[PDB]
């Protein structure tokens, strides 16, 4: 878990903003929110959240039983965290929310999937609430594509991590589906979100935020 | 430790202290706007509008340290500041002068700016943009530093709240906060759109901190 969380550090240079600017833009009013982590992974994100919010409700939706195992023992004996093993883009969400809140992962989505999911997000969502996506996002053209790899690239073979585990890290983005900041600006206005802002970016790593109000 | 010849300089090292004061992402605000201010020679002309002590002109010296520098400014007194930062140094230009009205003549590689062009009326922005293009040599770059204004009223209110924090807790006397408590600030979508309009290429905002950005445009 904490290894986990380690290593994340070494893909993501931008870590400590990254989590602290979603957290501190994460506010309802209730302090007693029920959460959705869409792609919880280990939960990082929700236990960030959690440090915000100790008596919020957390849902963390994850195809890996692995990753929701570690969760479960990071959040061992609080009853108030439910986990779901599904694929978050095919579930579907009967109970409503005060967040929907997602970390580095809506990006492996089809883009149908995502404008999709940015509409579905607003509807469950109660009558009032917030959605946070910090996530990847591609260069407005391909040399800022390209200028935003080459400086985390540097970033990456100079973490620490061995030759090994930086090869292995660009296998596994092979699969990003990632697309253009506005563009999901955009589906999430077009969604219904007003207030809609990124609040941070750091070359392709964004926060991006919408409320329903 | 800058790893090229500098001038000690007390003055403009309190100055330096007290922006890092105001600014809550400093490091990156002004890291990113060096790291993609990359153009091929290694003796750019680079102008600086709105340079005031010469702060980012100094950052970008670290990586061009024989670059020629052109700083402008309206403040005599900041650019005094600037010149006894470079003291020394032989290719630093200083023009007194509202950079915004200003016959450039001459062609620049990069045309940069770090926390000033906010202060403009919106058409001067708009035109500004359009003649930092016009001054540019092929593949040269245009970076602005700046606030921009939040999204909505909400937003806005956000930005704002949680700069105060940082400002009260940074080490700043009340006299300073209060000497900074003007701004013409916009968001940031529709000077993006002024950049790609005035006919730059590869525009984006490459780095953003609630109402800090980092915004970029390219000639080609
Ligand atoms: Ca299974
Ligand atoms: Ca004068």
């Not at 290894?3 to 550090?9: L, V």
């Not at 108030?80 to 990006?107: N, P």
């Not at 509409?119 to 996002?137: Q, T």
């Not at 092979?174 to 809609?196: H, P, S, T, Y």
Request: charged content about 30%; overall charge negative; aromatic content about 14%.
């Amino acid at each position: 878990s904490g290894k986990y969380d380690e290593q994340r550090r070494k893909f993501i240079p931008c870590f400590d903003d990254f989590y602290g600017v979603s957290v501190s833009i994460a506010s309802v009013d209730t302090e007693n929110p029920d959460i959705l982590d869409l792609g919880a992974g280990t939960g990082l994100l929700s236990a960030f959240l959690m440090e915000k919010y100790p008596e919020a409700t957390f849902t963390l939706v994850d195809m890996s039983e692995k990753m929701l195992e570690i969760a479960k023992n990071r959040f061992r004996g609080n009853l108030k965290v439910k986990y779901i093993e599904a694929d978050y883009s095919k579930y579907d969400f009967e109970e409503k929310y005060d967040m929907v809140v997602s970390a580095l992962s809506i990006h492996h989505l089809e883009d149908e999937d995502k404008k999709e999911l940015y509409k579905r997000s607003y509807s469950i969502l109660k009558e009032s609430g917030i959605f946070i996506n910090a996530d990847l996002v591609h260069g407005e053209t391909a040399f800022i594509e390209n200028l935003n790899k080459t400086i985390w690239r540097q970033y990456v073979e100079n973490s620490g991590l061995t030759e090994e585990e930086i090869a292995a890290g660009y296998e596994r983005s092979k699969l990003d589906k990632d697309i253009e900041m506005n563009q999901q600006l955009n589906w999430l206005k077009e969604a219904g979100f007003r207030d809609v802002s990124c609040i941070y970016k750091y070359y392709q790593f964004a926060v991006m935020f919408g409320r329903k109000t």
